Amino acid sequence: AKLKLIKIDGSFETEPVKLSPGLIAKELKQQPVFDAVLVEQASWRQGTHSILTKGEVRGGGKKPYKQKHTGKARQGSTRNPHFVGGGIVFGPKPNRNYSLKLNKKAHTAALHTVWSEKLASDNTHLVDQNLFNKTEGKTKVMMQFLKSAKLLDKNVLFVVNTLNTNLEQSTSNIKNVQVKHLDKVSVRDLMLANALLVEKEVLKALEGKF
Amino acid sequence: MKVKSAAKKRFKLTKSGQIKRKHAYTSHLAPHKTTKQKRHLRKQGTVSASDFKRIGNLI
Amino acid sequence: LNQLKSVPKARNHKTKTLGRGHGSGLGKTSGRGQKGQKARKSGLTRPGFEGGQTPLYRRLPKFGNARKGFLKQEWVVLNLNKIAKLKLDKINRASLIEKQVISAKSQLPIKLIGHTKLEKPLHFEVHKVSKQALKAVENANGSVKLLE
Amino acid sequence: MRIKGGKQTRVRRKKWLKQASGSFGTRHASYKVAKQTVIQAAKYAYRDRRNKKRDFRSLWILRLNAALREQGMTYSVFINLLKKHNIEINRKVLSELAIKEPSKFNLIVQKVKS
RNA sequence: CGAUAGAAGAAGCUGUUGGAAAGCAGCGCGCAAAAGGGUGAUAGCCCCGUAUUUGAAAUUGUUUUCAUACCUAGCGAGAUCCCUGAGUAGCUCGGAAAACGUUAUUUUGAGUGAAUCUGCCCAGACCAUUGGGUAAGCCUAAAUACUAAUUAGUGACCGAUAGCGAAACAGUACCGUGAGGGAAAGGUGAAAAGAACCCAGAGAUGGGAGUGAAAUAGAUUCUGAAACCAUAUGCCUACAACGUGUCAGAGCACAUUAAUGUGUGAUGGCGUGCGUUUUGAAGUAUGAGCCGGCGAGUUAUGAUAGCAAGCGUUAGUUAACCA
RNA sequence: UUGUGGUAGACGAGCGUUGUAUUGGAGUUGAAGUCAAAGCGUGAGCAUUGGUGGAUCCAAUACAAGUGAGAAUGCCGGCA
């Protein structure tokens, strides 16, 4: 179809730009997309979970309970996981794999299909540096843009290649929106926002790169 | 992954499995056997299905 | 799939529970027999050990290698059936690197092999050649350079 | 990641305690004995659901025979009286109740005399 | 180009309950800063801090340049001139390291012991040719791990049974003279603003009184479970052979999470617990005083098998490494 | 139609608990949690109301469990 630019007050243009048929995918592969979402989710583990094993506890190795003449377990160890001394014999480990072998063709297919269906979702909005330079970094003009865009429950992202200082000074005082570089985005982050503005120039780069 | 050398020196992998090995009772000597068996034990052997399963996880 | 919905289709299959009693199934029993050594933890005698019985490899002869301490030369075979799928003449290492055949940062000797009959004349370069392979290629009237 | 389930464990034990009560001694005031008694009570209830219908049948048979002996007839033949002839479907429990009904079982015993 | 005291640093009123509004609702502002914290519950407008602009007497880390050193640094013609790392390489008896359990290679505890670039050593015994280098003196940043730590930041880290034993003055106390073992417990309130007053008694203590929103906020101090100990509404039991309950159930007292309503039961029928092994315990096989909290199949690497998916038409895939 | 007895063991379908980003909500006009009740589920659970408590929690979809407690002459504590 076509897509045009929205001004700071909400005045859409009268001359949209046609969307080339080379940016739409007729195939849907949710499994690579879901795996990308999982591997993005599999990045919030700092590996801080750990406990003292049987040999890692600082305690006496003597036998608290003698073998005979006692009506309790033998238990030649002072501290044990079933005891109230503390620690688990296995417990959490800080050496979890956190490793998933990638497929470049699958990754590219997932990336391009999520791009195409975001384009086909019609939530994409045109944007350019011509307005990125016209702002001052104050979120007040961003506030006018958002009340004009009337979209706050969905995070709004701006795939950017220049990253003007005025543009990036915003999107922080208003927690709803954010700005992200074109390549640095992720499928999980892309669907997390679900609202997105695209530069007019990067369409050709996205189409060619696939 | 390590391979148990204790076994693989006696068995060699072939196509589609069927690991090939030499027949026993002859490496030391075969002094009380008929020529029929000796020339028929000259042919090599392949481990059985359960033996194949045991070799497979062993290697 | 969204923030509030991440349903799968067929994944995250059923696992086993070994410590949730018998209302959950297979509790203390843990599906490992009873009162046996194989039932004990860290059991499962070696793949070559049969629990006192003599290992089979201990009763079998040991292979001897004439090429002991030495290894075969790495001749990469160019099977004629599959090399016929792609069409290309004046075949050389400069082309094989592009054709996903030979390494781009190393030199590897090559071998020609195959059993499919063709007729177009080509240009071929290998270090080893097979009888029926060369016969089939020469019936195609092509040129083969057995590198010497 | 420390997972604590003390509240859930206590809730479970509490509802299991509230499943059954009303016992002498410290049988309803101890969770393990309480669940053991719940198990025994369920088994007892199943045992009743069988042996009590067995009872009811035998009990009506005995009650019907006791009334039958008063009028001069045995249970063995009277049940057969409805079977070989005068084929009716009245049940022994309903006939047992009709014994006490005024001028009703007299009609029943005079009808079988075809 | 930094650190070690620091300066600036922006955006709010009204009404309601609420103890308290900061919540909620109406009208605004504004954020290089809507990260955080506490301030009477749920505070962007209470504050700082925050991003940023800056500032440093003096210590003062790193980098660059200059003056000053240091060695550094060309090609030719000869001469068997002298020399180029001596008990050296090696040989022999027992070893050690090399993937090797002693073999090519290094060394020797012991003995013996050469050679001179022509020569010597190396080329998993050795040797011919040939290839490389000329051992038998020394040193070196870079990519090498780690934190006793000074500091900034983050935790699918834990929250007084956990987390280093170590949130309380924990290595405390205590114990064995001594090796060493080695625990326990935090939370008032909102600010003690700690219960003034009055009374019993020796006071402790307790009770009315009052403050305090609240004394279900009284110092055993956020809340305060059950087992356990008692009290009382009703039910019955002091003639009763009983895994002490179940299915019913007269009678007694009720009216509910409104449902053939419930609590209890004189009596009728039946009525030797659980976990584990042994063919097999009601078991006098064993373990349990009771209750509450903790408490035992997980992690890496590689393979196999199952399911599914991606991709391919000579496949998939990047290890390491770098932003 | 076989059935729905079946240990070992094979196999299948699940439920809840927390935090992870949610769409959302409630709460000094009472949240988590506690006690009781004369509810719904075959069940893992969920309510609803009443009482304390005065400040956090949950509904729905995937993630991970130091996740789900009946015995271990299981550990500690308290009470006999």
UniProtKB/Swiss-Prot annotation, chain A:
Gene Ontology cellular-component annotations: ribonucleoprotein complex; ribosome
What is a single molecular function from GO for this protein? Answer: rRNA binding
| Single GO BP term | translation
Per the entry, what this protein does is: One of the primary rRNA binding proteins, this protein initially binds near the 5'-end of the 23S rRNA. It is important during the early stages of 50S assembly. It makes multiple contacts with different domains of the 23S rRNA in the assembled 50S subunit and ribosome. Forms part of the polypeptide exit tunnel.
Quote the gene name from the UniProt entry. rplD
The domain of life for this entry's organism is Bacteria
UniProt cross-references to Pfam families, sorted A to Z: Ribosomal_L4 (PF00573)
Q: Where is the composition biased (Basic residues)?
A: 60-72
The alphabetical list of record keywords is: Antibiotic resistance, Ribonucleoprotein, Ribosomal protein, RNA-binding, rRNA-binding
Concerning its family, UniProt says: Belongs to the universal ribosomal protein uL4 family.
Query: What is the source species?
Result: Mycoplasma pneumoniae (strain ATCC 29342 / M129 / Subtype 1)
Identification of the protein by name: Large ribosomal subunit protein uL4
Which residue intervals make up region (Disordered)?
54-85
Q: Note the NCBIfam families from the entry.
A: rplD_bact
Assembly: Part of the 50S ribosomal subunit.
HAMAP family for this protein: Ribosomal_uL4_B
InterPro entries registered for this protein in UniProt: Ribosomal_uL4, Ribosomal_uL4-like, Ribosomal_uL4_dom_sf
Presence of keyword rRNA-binding: yes
Effect of mutating residue 69 to L: After 32, 37 and 48 antibiotic passages; confers resistance to various antibiotics in combination with a 23S rRNA mutation and up to 3 mutations in protein L22
Query: Is the keyword Amino-acid biosynthesis in the record?
Result: no
UniProtKB/Swiss-Prot annotation, chain B:
Recall the GO molecular function terms of this protein's record: structural constituent of ribosome
Fetch the InterPro entries from UniProt: Ribosomal_bL35, Ribosomal_bL35-like, Ribosomal_bL35_CS, Ribosomal_bL35_sf
Basic residues bias (residue ranges): 30-43
User: Do you know which Gene3D superfamilies this protein is assigned to?
Assistant: 4.10.410.60
Tell me, which GO biological process terms does this entry list? translation
Disulfide linkages recorded for this protein, renumbered to the chain, are none
Q: Does the keyword Nucleotidyltransferase apply?
A: no
The ranges of region (Disordered) come to 1-22, 30-49
The record's listing under Pfam families reads: Ribosomal_L35p
Task: Could you list this entry's UniProt keywords, alphabetically sorted.
Answer: Ribonucleoprotein, Ribosomal protein
List the record's Gene Ontology CC terms alphabetically: cytosolic large ribosomal subunit
Q: Which NCBIfam families match?
A: rpmI_bact
- Family in the record: Belongs to the bacterial ribosomal protein bL35 family.
Q: What is this protein called?
A: Large ribosomal subunit protein bL35
Query: Which organism does this record belong to?
Result: Mycoplasma pneumoniae (strain ATCC 29342 / M129 / Subtype 1) (Mycoplasmoides pneumoniae)
Q: Which gene encodes it?
A: rpmI
Curated annotation (Swiss-Prot), chain C:
Question: Which Pfam families does the record cross-reference, listed alphabetically?
Answer: Ribosomal_L27A
Q: Gene3D superfamilies under this entry?
A: 3.100.10.10
Q: Which domain of life is it from?
A: Bacteria
Record region (Disordered): 1-56
Q: Extract the coiled-coil ranges from the record.
A: none
Q: Name one GO molecular function term.
A: rRNA binding
- Record-level GO BP terms: translation
Keywords (A to Z) from UniProt: Ribonucleoprotein, Ribosomal protein, RNA-binding, rRNA-binding
Q: Which InterPro entries match?
A: Ribosomal_uL15, Ribosomal_uL15/eL18, Ribosomal_uL15/eL18_sf, Ribosomal_uL15_bac-type
Question: Is Ribonucleoprotein set as a keyword in this record?
Answer: yes
**What are the Basic residues biased-composition ranges?**
8-19
Gly residues bias located where? 20-34
Gene Ontology terms: cellular component: cytosolic large ribosomal subunit
Function of the molecule: Binds to the 23S rRNA.
Member of which family? Belongs to the universal ribosomal protein uL15 family.
Instruction: Name the NCBIfam families for this protein.
Output: rplO_bact
PANTHER family from the xrefs? 50S RIBOSOMAL PROTEIN L15 (PTHR12934), LARGE RIBOSOMAL SUBUNIT PROTEIN UL15M (PTHR12934:SF11)
Q: Could you give the subunit structure recorded for this chain? A: Part of the 50S ribosomal subunit.
Q: What is this protein called?
A: Large ribosomal subunit protein uL15
Curated annotation (Swiss-Prot), chain D:
Its cellular-component GO annotations read: ribonucleoprotein complex; ribosome
Tell me, what is an example of a GO biological process annotation in this record?
translation
Show the disulfide pairing. none
Signal sequence segment:
none
What SUPFAM superfamilies does its record include?
Ribosomal protein L20
GO molecular function per UniProt? rRNA binding; structural constituent of ribosome
Gene3D superfamilies in alphabetical order: 6.10.160.10, Ribosomal protein L20
Alphabetical UniProt keywords: Ribonucleoprotein, Ribosomal protein, RNA-binding, rRNA-binding
Nuclease is among the record's keywords: no
What NCBIfam families does the record tag this protein with?
rplT_bact
The job of this chain, per UniProt, is described as: Binds directly to 23S ribosomal RNA and is necessary for the in vitro assembly process of the 50S ribosomal subunit. It is not involved in the protein synthesizing functions of that subunit.
Family recorded in the similarity comment: Belongs to the bacterial ribosomal protein bL20 family.
Instruction: Please report the name of this protein according to its UniProt entry.
Output: Large ribosomal subunit protein bL20
Q: What is the source species?
A: Mycoplasma pneumoniae (strain ATCC 29342 / M129 / Subtype 1)
